[PDB]
Structures are given as C-alpha cells and as structure tokens.
Amino acid sequence: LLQGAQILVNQVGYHPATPKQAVLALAPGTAAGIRPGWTPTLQIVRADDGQVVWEGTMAGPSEDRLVSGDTLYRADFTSLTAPGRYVAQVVGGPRSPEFAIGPVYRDVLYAAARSYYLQRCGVAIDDPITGVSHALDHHEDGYVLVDDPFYRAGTRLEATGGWHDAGDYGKYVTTTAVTAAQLLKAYELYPQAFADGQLHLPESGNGVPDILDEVRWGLEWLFRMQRPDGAVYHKLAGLRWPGMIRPEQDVQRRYVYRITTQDTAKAAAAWAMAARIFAPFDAAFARKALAAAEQAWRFLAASGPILDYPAEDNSGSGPYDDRDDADDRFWAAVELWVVTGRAEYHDYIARMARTGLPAYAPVSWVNPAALGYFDYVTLGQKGDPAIRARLVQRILEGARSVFQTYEQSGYGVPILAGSFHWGSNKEALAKGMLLLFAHHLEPRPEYERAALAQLDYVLGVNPLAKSYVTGLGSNPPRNPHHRLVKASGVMVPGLLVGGPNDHPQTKAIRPHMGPRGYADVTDSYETNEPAIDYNAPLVFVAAHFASL
Ligand SMILES: [Ca+2]
Ligand SMILES: [Ca+2]
Ligand SMILES: [Zn+2]
C-alpha cells in the first residue's frame, strides 16, 4: 500500500523554531484505491538509535491537481525542537534520508553565498575547502565588438574579473547587476547573518562582511563595463560556446558587446544601492559607486531606449534580450533618489507614476523593479505620500497573489502546471522574496511559512525528492551543466540549478511534465544548469531563516 510511495523532507533539515513539514507522496499509479479513512502514521527517529522521538498521524489525502498530480499526505513535526540528526519513517512505509535539526540555514547560506567566489573569472583559484582549482582564466577580457564614440572595433578594454554567469564562462551585465543588488538587499535586511571572514575568501579579515567583498567583485567588473559617457556594455563573451573544458583552456578571443540602456540603468541601480550600503565600511568605494551611478543616469536622461540584440551576438553566449528599460530606469531612479535625496531622481519617479508604474513582479533580469518598490517604501525619505501608498498596496497584493498560488500547490512551490519555465527554481525563491517583502511591511506568519516552503522545496520537498543545490542534501545534482565541474570532476558546491521546465530545448526531458520536467544530466542546460541570478534569491531567502 505504501510502495513505492516516498516521504519528502528538507534534506538539509529544519531550524528549531520553524514549522517542519514532511510530505508523503503516493505513486502516480496508485489510489485510486485509497481505502476511505486510511491514515498513515509518521515517526521521526534519531539517526543513531532508531529511537522514536515524534509520532503523528498524517493529514490527507489531498490531490495536487493543479501542479504535480500526486496524492499527498502531510505532517508537521514542529513540536520536535531537540537539536540533532534524524530520519522520517512512515510506519509500514518509506523512510526519508537523514536530516538535521539545528541552525541549518547558516550552512545553506554559506554554500550559496560562497559559490560566487567559486564562479569568479580572471583569477586563479586553488581552494582547499572545496578542492576547486583552475589557473588564471580569461585574462584577455576583452575586445570591443562594434565601433562606438570611444573605441573602434578591436580595441582592448580591461574588463577582466566579474563572475562566470552560469555553466558557461560568459559575463553578462544584465544578470550581474540584479544579482549584486539582491545580495546587497540580503545583507541590508539581514546584516546579522553576514560577518567578516564568514565566507573564507581572499578578502576575509579586511573588516568588511565577506558578502560585501563578493558583491564588490561583481560591481568592480561593472565599472570596467562602463564607457566614459556612462553607458554600460551588455556582456562579454567568445564568438563560440566553449566545450566542456576548464576556463583557462577557453583561450578564444573574447568580445565586449554593445551598450544597452537597460544594462546602463540596472548598473546605476546596483551601484546606487552599494553607495548606501558600503558607506560605513569603505567610503571611497561608496563614492566611486555613486559617481558611476550618477554618470550612467546622465547618459540615460539624454538617451531614448537602446535595446538592440542582434541575433549574431548570440553565437557564443545567451541573449538576455530584456526588451524594455522602463522598469530598470524606475529602479535606478529610486536607488539614486534614496542615496542622494535629489529632486531630479524623484521627478522621474513622479512622472512615471502619472502614466503607469512598472508592473510588480518577482525580481528578475527582465524586471527588477520590485526592489525599487521596496526601497522607496522602506528607505525613501520625504517622498510623495500618494506614491508611497500605491507602492505599499502593490507590495501586499504581490505577496497575496503569490500566497494564493502557494495554497493551490501540494508541494509549496508557487507555480502551476503549464507555467514551469527555465529557472523555475529561481522564480520560486524570488516569489519567496515577495512574501518576505510583504512580511516585512506587515508581519504575517503564513507568509514566512510560505517563504520557508521555497527553501524546503528546492532542498528536497518536491515530487522528484531532489535537492536542486549542488553539494547539499542527500540527492543533489551530480551532473550539472557546468563546464568546470564536468572538466575537473570536482563539484562546485552551493549552486542552485534552474529546475523543472515545461518547455524543453534538449533531448533528455519531454514537454509539459511540470514539477517533474527535470533531468540530472550534463547536457540539460535548460533544467540542470546553475546561474548567478538563481543563487541571488537563494542567498536572500536563506539569510532570512539564518538570522531570525
Ligand atoms: Ca571581509
Ligand atoms: Ca527591463
Ligand atoms: Zn573566466
């Protein structure tokens, strides 16, 4: 009757203070013959003894009709708060992998945040913690692709550094800027989760929280991607996709692709954020970030949309073809307004408020404007009270629609069947972030539970019983679409893979499988590839639960 059902738990585990779910999922070909009134019993059991420490009848069945299709039962063993290691065991039924009760999101946060260090480009790594190593890569980054006012095609720019974007080695302003902004916000809201020396970095012990050293790596690369008029180049990559080789073997010439106004505004926003946040630690870096943001805005105020993405620029890198810059300009306006207080920036906001504010949506490289909504409401001084009230209402409504989807979803993931896209994991966690934004304005325990459920979900509470974060839990991605991992045979831990995707591009998954549309194989770049913008909301949501 309980074959082959599965009991799903967070494969890392649970903090003592939080709700603690376990989900019994029945075989797709099964009940059907649910004997009416049948009730599964769950025990939690010490890993060492097998001593039962918690026992409870499971609620259910429920049919996850809008998402997985599964028949679920569930328990909440919140009561159990004794630190240690455990297994969940359905009587006469399946057993879970081992998990801890303890401050588990400190280690999750660590791995996710430190993964950026392991993605850095343009610098040798020989890391003893991890075993990850490669010699100096991409020290020739890079040559200007098209003529512009400053440089002829073929000019060498010093645009070394930054992060490898994903499982390739391209560096892209569009993800780098939203990623840096989101790490910054994690730190700003949860500074007590982030210390100097936390991340075992080259910068550990300089008196600055390591997460800010990492952010600074990304932002300093943005500086090199900025043209003296303030415009920001779109991305830097080879003409060809490297094979599964090390980054130091990827010796093709690399090119700096043409500017874009969305990139210019995203970098403005992230820099203006850093100006505010780095002020107590490094006042000179603060100023510099502020000067850059200001020069970028000068460019934007003199320029219409520039959003050209020639198909041929995609020959060795992804497009990130964000085809509207208004949500990016809004965000840049807010952040500049917040740190300078200047009318010129608030004027832009008020003008937009007359014709229509950017749509409120989970933070993404297309639309980052939720950060502007939030930062205006929480950080803006002497604003317009009618705008502020509009921003607040949109923030609470956004969480509300997220929460409604979460309630429709047996596994917690706020995404319905038919809507699983490339990066669905990131989208889950980013929706977790909108719940937490609303929670921050208006505390609401169910929202915090729903956000936690996004961590549980990416860490094994899902119909594949899969941990989508490398090196975490008991069933992580062993074959990530990641060139260094594949070439080196050394795992890079702490990277979140995209996850389930209804719309396949490769051979190893079929369409419309929803939360089941995933394959742990190297080739599946649409399902099993990590990216910097995936890790960003992971670090955010994890930091919430690492600090309380
Ligand atoms: Ca430091
Ligand atoms: Ca945009
Ligand atoms: Zn590199």
UniProtKB/TrEMBL annotation:
Domain of life: Bacteria
Residues involved in Ca(2+) 2 binding: D322, D324, D327, D328, V366
Residues reported to bind Ca(2+) 1: D196, E203, N206, V208, D210, D213
Alphabetic keyword roster: Calcium, Metal-binding, Zinc
Calcium keyword on record: yes
UniProt keyword annotation of Zinc present: yes
Positions that bind Zn(2+): D137, H138, H164
Protein name: Cellulase
Biological source species: uncultured bacterium
